[PDB]
Amino acid sequence: GRLNIAVLPTIAPYLLPRVFPIWKKELAGLEIHVSEMQTSRCLASLLSGEIDMAIIASKAETEGLEDDLLYYEEFLGYVSRCEPLFEQDVIRTTEVNPHRLWLLDEGHSFRDQLVRFCAYSGGSMEAFMRLVESGQGITFIPQLTVEQLSPSQKELVRPFGMPRPVREVRLAVRQDYSRRKLREQLIGLLRSAVPSDMHKLQTGQHL
Amino acid sequence: GRLNIAVLPTIAPYLLPRVFPIWKKELAGLEIHVSEMQTSRCLASLLSGEIDMAIIASKAETEGLEDDLLYYEEFLGYVSRCEPLFEQDVIRTTEVNPHRLWLLDEGHSFRDQLVRFCQMAYSGGSMEAFMRLVESGQGITFIPQLTVEQLSPSQKELVRPFGMPRPVREVRLAVRQDYSRRKLREQLIGLLRSAVPSDMHKLQTGQHLA
Numbered sequence A: 001g002r003l004n005i006a007v008l009p010t011i012a013p014y015l016l017p018r019v020f021p022i023w024k025k026e027l028a029g030l031e032i033h034v035s036e037m038q039t040s041r042c043l044a045s046l047l048s049g050e051i052d053m054a055i056i057a058s059k060a061e062t063e064g065l066e067d068d069l070l071y072y073e074e075f076l077g078y079v080s081r082c083e084p085l086f087e088q089d090v091i092r093t094t095e096v097n098p099h100r101l102w103l104l105d106e107g108h109s110f111r112d113q114l115v116r117f118c119a120y121s122g123g124s125m126e127a128f129m130r131l132v133e134s135g136q137g138i139t140f141i142p143q144l145t146v147e148q149l150s151p152s153q154k155e156l157v158r159p160f161g162m163p164r165p166v167r168e169v170r171l172a173v174r175q176d177y178s179r180r181k182l183r184e185q186l187i188g189l190l191r192s193a194v195p196s197d198m199h200k201l202q203t204g205q206h207l
Numbered sequence B: 001g002r003l004n005i006a007v008l009p010t011i012a013p014y015l016l017p018r019v020f021p022i023w024k025k026e027l028a029g030l031e032i033h034v035s036e037m038q039t040s041r042c043l044a045s046l047l048s049g050e051i052d053m054a055i056i057a058s059k060a061e062t063e064g065l066e067d068d069l070l071y072y073e074e075f076l077g078y079v080s081r082c083e084p085l086f087e088q089d090v091i092r093t094t095e096v097n098p099h100r101l102w103l104l105d106e107g108h109s110f111r112d113q114l115v116r117f118c119q120m121a122y123s124g125g126s127m128e129a130f131m132r133l134v135e136s137g138q139g140i141t142f143i144p145q146l147t148v149e150q151l152s153p154s155q156k157e158l159v160r161p162f163g164m165p166r167p168v169r170e171v172r173l174a175v176r177q178d179y180s181r182r183k184l185r186e187q188l189i190g191l192l193r194s195a196v197p198s199d200m201h202k203l204q205t206g207q208h209l210a
Helices: A012-026 A039-048 A109-117 A125-133 A143-148 A180-192 B012-026 B039-047 B109-118 B127-135 B145-150 B182-194
Strands: A002-007 A031-036 A053-056 A065-079 A138-142 A157-159 A164-174 B003-007 B032-036 B053-056 B065-079 B140-144 B166-176 B207-209
Touching (some): A002 A039, A039 A164, A065 A143, A125 A138, A138 A143, B003 B012, B003 B039, B053 B182, B140 B145
16 A cells, blocks of 8 residues: 655654654555645645645645644744844744744745744745854744754744744544544554653643 | 845755845845745746846756856765765765655756766655754755755764765856846855855866766
C-alpha cells in the first residue's frame, strides 16, 4: 500500500523530523509520500482524492471532510536584539510596531489566526527568522521550533502574556475514508511524536 | 515611486539579512517592497510591470530583459551524522543514496541547475525542512554557500563541499531593457555586491559555472 499525506508549510519542518523515525518503525514497509501544501489545497486534494490524509492546523469545516485533534501548540514571539520589546520578557501585543513586523501571506492559517487574536510578501518563516537573528524586527514562530533552536536563538524567544493563543493541529481525511484502521493508528503515532502535555489545552492557554 | 523588487526563495533568507541595513543607510527615504518568487514568475512579472527588479540565479535570456552580475555562489552538501558519506570530506553526487536525499521541486532553479550540471517521498519541501531533517540525523540535501555564515558551529560540521570542479551559480539583477531609474539601478548593483564577501565577486580557481 501507498500513503499520501499532505502537511502545512508551517508544520512540516518542526513535526517531520520527529515522526519520520516513528513511521519508519511502526508502519514498516508502508510506502509514504509527503507533500507540503497550504490548507485550501489540502482540503481540495482530500476531496479530489489526490491525497489520503492531511496534517493541518484547524477544523476542515466542509461536508465530506472530518478531522481529529492531535495536539495544541502556542504562538511565540521572536524578537530582535534592537527592539524595545527585547528588554521585556513577554510579548506585549500593544507595544509591537507593525512597520517592523514580519508576517506570512494571507492564506497561511498561521497568519490568519494570529491577526484575528490581535513591505515583504511571499516570505518564508526561514527568511523572517534569519532577519530577526540579525537585528531586523519581529516575527512569530510556532512553539515546536524552540527545541530545534540553538541557545542563542533561544534568547530571542518571547512568549505572549496570558491568555496565550494556541492553534490546534489536526488530522483530516474524507468522512468515508475507507481505511479506518490506518487512520486511527496514525492519530496514534502523530500524537505520540510530541510531548504529552501538548495533547491537552492548559490553563493560561486559549484558542 | 517605490521600488518593487523580487527575490528567489533560495536567496532571500541568506542575502536579505546582509543587504537590508545597508539599504537603509544608503538609500534613506526610499520605500522598498520585497516579494519572494521563483524564476519564471520573476521574469513574467518584470515584463508585465508588476515588479521593477528581480534578483535571480541565472541570465534573464528573455526578449525585453537584461541583467547584471552580482556574485558567484557554490552549491554545498549538507550531510547528517548518520549517513555513510559523513566520513568523507568531499561529496560526490554519483555516490549519494537517492532514497535519502531531499530536493526542491523541478522549477526551482537551484535544483534544476544542480541536477542538469551534475547529471544526477517528499514533494513541495522547503530548504528549512530539509535542513531540520539533516540535523536530526536523517538524509542529505544541498545548500547555497552564502547560508554557511548563518550556521552555528554544530551545523557547520555537516557541510561538505564538492571536489573540483566545484559548481557555482551566478546571482544577477534583472530589469526591463527600457527601464527608467538607471541611476538607482547602478547604486543597487553596488549595494548588493558589497553585501557579500569579496571572494564571491569573481570566479575562483576550481569553480565552474553550472
